[model samples]
Target: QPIFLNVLEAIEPGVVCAGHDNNQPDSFAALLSSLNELGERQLVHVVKWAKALPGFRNLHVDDQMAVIQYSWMGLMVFAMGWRSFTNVNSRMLYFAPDLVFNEYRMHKSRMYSQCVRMRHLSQEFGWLQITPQEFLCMKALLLFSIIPVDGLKNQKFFDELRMNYIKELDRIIACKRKNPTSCSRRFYQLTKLLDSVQPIARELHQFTFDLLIKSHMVSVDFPEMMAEIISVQVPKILSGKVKPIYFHT
Candidate 1:
């Protein structure tokens, strides 16, 4: 299949040359300029929407932190590849039908399971181990779906969310262990990977709570609020080279 796809590319000249016509330099430049402008505009729109979301504003500080942490990490995962994203999304969705619920339940489950199984086999057989790219995709799954407010922390109400999250994490870890590779290298690698990401997850939880308080979305004690305010604002202040200040009449 791979060779066939490669051969198709070789034979299809127009496929490779669709946008490389040197004779149309002016048109090409105009197209490139338009695309660049569109990209910038799209990015600005995303930031604006993110800032204006009411649900976002209303979320608890911990939830908000989870959002940013998972979102960035999820993006990094998608950058890894379509296949990796497919693998992780499929596994989670299959095991937990409640993830997607009715909206996308109609989608094929086999494709999801197959991709995950293939990736797992690749890791086990030592044929072609999961790439850093694939790892990012895994991280994305963990962050976006596994640790999101709705999935991990808000499933059975806020108080019991942490316990549920720990339970789910154990399930995933067990899956990895059950499918161990020769010399247990694959299992060991997965354990290390999980550990590396845990701290970031905790920090994200902290950051979310802070954002919630700073935005005045929650009414908590002064000391708790102050602590979150400091934790959340310090990084923004240092990175942006601006001091933290607030004005109240």
Candidate 2:
């Protein structure tokens, strides 16, 4: 009565290609390798997941696939964009760590000098009473932003940052692999993180669209901009005989 073996036979081939064995360390590593083998295969399970979502199943197949593809690439684009932004920010912070500190010191010293001069004019003029402790505290605060700047420019900086995030992601995936846990919960959390960043990704995608696509600047529509890039680029990269498949409704 249990249709277990029949389902296993049908799914095993796909799983094998995706490196979906109990022996593998994590499902995401498997998924990444599977993505390397064939493009559409990486999308199969994701399509099913999308179809199972409320309101998503009702959409036409093309629309569903469009949404999925856009969402996937948009998240990736956002991550890369964030990396670049952080890189630039780190560089600026490194070189100019003392810029704010020096500026503040100059302003404070000038104010103190003016207060002293004004006090000479009249004893009623209140003195700027900055203590040695207060001056030292401001310098210490300046160092907080300065020390980290040098570390950010090093390649290891982003690599370590990315590795830590991947480790956290892998830990969640590990829970899903256990018998007592729910894969849906892990999947939902991951998707939620991705969804939260969609708008940010779109905004970044728009900023890079013209340079990458050599097209006139259009409105910041993330999905449409993504589609245009894919349409133009994918065909040139792939063999003419190999057609890209979109998940059907």
Candidate 3:
């Protein structure tokens, strides 16, 4: 087994619950608050998971926090999509085992369009026949997907780290397929799939930014940590200060 694969499996975060009460009737305020709570829980795991990745410690301290903060939503969403695929067969959004989103819950969330895109993401896992190893590598790669346009505290180190991750993904792609043309084609497909996460994340970024601006008005609550990051780090992405690194044009 590859050392990278071993490290990834060893460091993978376990199941996290959203702590939502399903007995209560679903409402926008209820659902959003639970999602916010779930985000906070997932953030903790993300920090631990990222730190355990092979090259993460090489990043400057500030760069480590910045990349994790910038990419948290995409990381959570992608992992959630995978969970939905594996657990519910992509029929619903598995925000958590206790907080699954049915069609009605999706409607109640008031981000129906974004939910639809996420469901499409969930289905992609099955359609593409993505392997467990591929999912692990891709999730780690997502942590390196976004950054400030001016660069990080150690841009040279960050760039080298990102390159190595892409190379690892290529190695995973070619491991099963021996033909050169087929390996190149699978690389193209996987990169395209990874690129698709950016747009969905951007839409949610816009939605959350707007929601945070008037959260009190709607009786929706954002946790202390989540609110701070949404108000601070998220704005950079929304205003084009931070940008996603895409593999395609």
Candidate 4:
């Protein structure tokens, strides 16, 4: 169906462009300005990907926000990995030239730096030879996640949605390789790979909060989408009564 094609397009973000040069910025001041912008752009990439799923917008508005807030960074990291999958040999990760922070001089970016964990996940996906169909299923599974979030409602509904996508993914893997054994192998590998991303996502979240929120790296006015996604998910004991904050992002 047309919706499925849209899903495919959304997952295949763009060309495997080259990494930035050695002359890329090397200051927290520059990185803060650029990272805030790039982080929003990365969240936008995940937003459009979610839009491709059938009936996504039809969900209750709060549920929609929960899905977006909960999954944004995971999918953003996945986007980071998936895009870098195109050219596996590069020394640095690549995004829109404006968005990338390279391994070339990672110490410069400090808070927004890309570490080996991110690179390892990217290489793992690339080595797995992830196809568009599998990537679509992974994104779908993440969006329809049953992962517990503080403000998320209708937990059972997203649980069933998650299960159905799993079935759909199994069906896709079933059809992709004609050999029965090979199909099963890939089914395990790909689905297991999806399973693997969760821990890595959480670790990345911890690292980000540690470096940025816990340390005085720079004055970072995070995008609403980025903050909400990371805030509820990260560990903290601080609290106060505040007016309701809402976003459609």
Instruction: Give candidate 2 regions above 4 Å deviation.
Output: 1-35, 74-196, 199-229, 232-249
Give lDDT tens digits, candidate 4, residues 1-249.
Answer: 345546565555543323223365466555554554566666665676566566566566677766676556566666667766665443465555544657643566663334566677778776887887778777677666434434346655565666667777777777647888988788778766765666666666666565557434465456675565456644431122111111111
TM-score of each: 0.27, 0.23, 0.99, 0.75
lDDT tens digits, residue span 1-249, model 3: 789999999999999998998889899999999999999999999999999999899999999999999999999999999999999999999999899999989999999999999999999999998999999999999999999999999899999999999999988988978799978888888899999999999999999999999999989899988999999999999999999999999
**TM-score computed on alpha carbons, candidate 1:** 0.27
Full candidate order by TM-score, most accurate first: 3, 4, 1, 2
Model 3, global lDDT: 0.94
lDDT of 2: 0.32
> Mind giving the per-residue lDDT tens digits that candidate 2 earns over 172-204?
355327653555554444434333333343333
CA shift of 15, model 1, Å: 20
Local distance difference test values of all predictions, in order: 0.34, 0.32, 0.94, 0.59
Better of 1 and 4 by lDDT: 4
Better of 1 and 3 by lDDT: 3
lDDT of 1: 0.34
The TM-score that candidate 4 achieves is: 0.75
